[PDB]
C-alpha cells in the first residue's frame, strides 16, 4: 500500500532502494511506516544551508547553532571554492525533503534536521564540547563526519570538555536514555591509518561507521580497526556510483564521497529506529546494530566468526546496516539491563617487548561482585608502553572464546617515539561473548628493524551485563 518517493533523483539513490538487493533496505522501513517523524538529528559540521529547497521543510532551529561565530544561525560561509558545503551534503543524506520535485530524499525524510556550524574556525575543546552538548533534551541524534587528521601517524582524541560532553550526553541526554553519537571512522586508508588511534571513533559512546563501495568492496579511503561497529554504502572507483544529496547554493550533487557520507546514512537509519521505539537507550541502539547488521555481499579478507556466531571484519564491523531489520527488531526490543563495568589490571611487572610479547591472563570477569559480567559489550585494553618506532607495532587481543581483535595494525608512517600513554584500544568484536577465561594480548614488531620498548601497563576493562 506504501507509495515511494517521486523525487527526480530518488532513482539514483541506489543505496536506499534497489532491484539489485545490494542496498541499506531503507524502503522496507518506510513501508513499515517509519520515516523519522518526531525525531531530531543535528549535523555537527561546517554549517547547514537551512534555506536549501530540499532542507527548509525539515530544518529545526532548536537543533542548530553557530559555535564558530557565537550566534544561533548555522548558515554556511560562502566562498568561491565552496569550502563549507560539507555540512549541507551530510544533512541532506539524513533528512532531505521527500516528494517535492527537488533532488532526492533523506533516509529519515520526515525527521527534523538541524546543524551546528563548528568546523569553520578554530576547533577547540570548548567548541567541540558545546556542539556535542547542544540541547541534549531536544536533539536525539548527533552526526559527526570529522575528526583528527588522517595522516596515519597521529594518536588523538577528545579533550576534557569534549569527554565530559560525551559522558553527560549518554547519561542525561534524551531524558536519561542517552544521546546517540554517530561517527565517521575516517579517510586515512591510503596512509594506512587505524581508526583505533582516533579517540572519537574509538569511544564506546559513539557508533563508528565505516564504508563499502557499490560493488561491495573496502574503499581506498577506508580505515580498519576493532572499534568500528557497522557499515553503510559510500563512494568507490569511477565505475561505482556515489552519494546523491543536497549541495551548497541550493544545488543537488551526485558526488558526495568518502567516510563523510556513511555516518549521515547511519544517523538516518537510527532516526527511523528511534521512531519505531522512542524508549531505546544509547546502549540498546548499539545492540540493535550488532544484531541486525548484514555481512553478506560485503567482500573482506578478514571476516571471522566470533564466540557467538557472528561474522565481524575490521573494515566493516558487523556489516551493512539493515533499516528494515532495525525498525523491525526495535519494536519488540526489551531494554537491556544496567551497564556494568569490570576493571582488571593485568601486569604485576613491566614487560620487555622485543620482537614479540605475549601476555596471558585468566579472568573471572568480576565473579561474585555487583559488576560481574557474563554478556560482554565493549571491551577496552588500556595500554601504556614505550617504543622507538610506534608504527612498526601490531597489537592483538584474543578473547577467551577465541575472537581475535586487532587493536592496532602497523602504520608505516608513524615514526613516533612517544609510544602509548594509557591509550584505550577498544573492540566491539566480542560483543555478547562470556568474558571469563583466558585473555591474550599480543604485541609484535612487524618490521625487520631491531626495535625496542617496554609494556608498563595493560588494564582490561569490560562493559556489559549479567
Amino acid at each position: 500500500v506504501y507509495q515511494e518517493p517521486t523525487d527526480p533523483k530518488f532513482p539514483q539513490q541506489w543505496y536506499l532502494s534497489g532491484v539489485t538487493q545490494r542496498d541499506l533496505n531503507v524502503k522496507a522501513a518506510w513501508a513499515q511506516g517509519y520515516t523519522g517523524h518526531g525525531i531530531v538529528v543535528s549535523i555537527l559540521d561546517d554549517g547547514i544551508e537551512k534555506n536549501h529547497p530540499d532542507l527548509a521543510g525539515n530544518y529545526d532551529p532548536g537543533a542548530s547553532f553557530d559555535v564558530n561565530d557565537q550566534d544561533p544561525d548555522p548558515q554556511p560561509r560562502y566562498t568561491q571554492m565552496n569550502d563549507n558545503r560539507h555540512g549541507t551534503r551530510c544533512a541532506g543524506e539524513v533528512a532531505a525533503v521527500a516528494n517535492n520535485g527537488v533532488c532526492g530524499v533523506g533516509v529519515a525524510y520526515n525527521a527534523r534536521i538541524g546543524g551546528v556550524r563548528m568546523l569553520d574556525g578554530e576547533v577547540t575543546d570548548a567548541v567541540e564540547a558545546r556542539s556535542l552538548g547542544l540541547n541534549p533534551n531536544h536533539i536525539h541524534i548527533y552526526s559527526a563526519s570529522w575528526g583528527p587528521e588522517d595522516d596515519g601517524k597521529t594518536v588523538d582524541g577528545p579533550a576534557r570538555l569534549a569527554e565530559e560532553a560525551f559522558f553527560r550526553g549518554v547519561s542525561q541526554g534524551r531524558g536519561g536514555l542517552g544521546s546517540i553519537f554517530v561517527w565517521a571512522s575516517g579517510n586515512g586508508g591510503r596512509e594506512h591509518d587505524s581508526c583505533n588511534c582516533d579517540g572519537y571513533t574509538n569511544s564506546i559512546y559513539t557508533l563508528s561507521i565505516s564504508s563499502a563501495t557499490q560493488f561491495g568492496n573496502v574503499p581506498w579511503y577506508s580505515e580498519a580497526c576493532s572499534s568500528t561497529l557497522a557499515t553503510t554504502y559510500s563512494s568507490g572507483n569511477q565505475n561505482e556510483k556515489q552519494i546523491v544529496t543536497t549541495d551548497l547554493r541550493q544545488k543537488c550533487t551526485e558526488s558526495h564521497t568518502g567516510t563523510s557520507a556513511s555516518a549521515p546514512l547511519a544517523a538516518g537509519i537510527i532516526a527511523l529506529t528511534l521512531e519505531a521505539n522512542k524508549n531505546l537507550t544509547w546502549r540498546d541502539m548499539q545492540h540493535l546494530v550488532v544484531q541486525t547488521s548484514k555481512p553478506a555481499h560485503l567482500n573482506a579478507n578478514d571476516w571471522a566468526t566470533n564466540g557467538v556466531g557472528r561474522k565481524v571484519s575490521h573494515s566493516y564491523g558487523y556489516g551493512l546496516l539493515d533499516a528494515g531489520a532495525m525498525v523491525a527488531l526495535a519494536q519488540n526490543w526489551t531494554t537491556v539491563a544496567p551497564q556494568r563495568k569490570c576493571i582488571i589490571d593485568i601486569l604485576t611487572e613491566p614487560k620487555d617487548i622485543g620482537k614479540r610479547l605475549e601476555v596471558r591472563k585468566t579472568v573471572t570477569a568480576c565473579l561474585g561482585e555487583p559488576n560481574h559480567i557474563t554478556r560482554l559489550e565493549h571491551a577496552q585494553a588500556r595500554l601504556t608502553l614505550s617504543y622507538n618506532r610506534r608504527g612498526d607495532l601490531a597489537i592483538h587481543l584474543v578473547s577467551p572464546m577465541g575472537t581475535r581483535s586487532t587493536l592496532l595494525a602497523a602504520r608505516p608512517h608513524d615514526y613516533s617515539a612517544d609510544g602509548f600513554n594509557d591509550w584505550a584500544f577498544m573492540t566491539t568484536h566480542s560483543w555478547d561473548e562470556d568474558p571469563s577465561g583466558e585473555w591474550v594480548l599480543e604485541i609484535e614488531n612487524t618490521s625487520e628493524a631491531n626495535n625496542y620498548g617496554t609494556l608498563t601497563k595493560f588494564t582490561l576493562v569490560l562493559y556489559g551485563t549479567a
Partner: peptide
C-alpha cells in the same frame, strides 16, 4: 586539528 580537526578535518572534514
Amino acid at each position: 586539528x580537526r578535518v572534514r
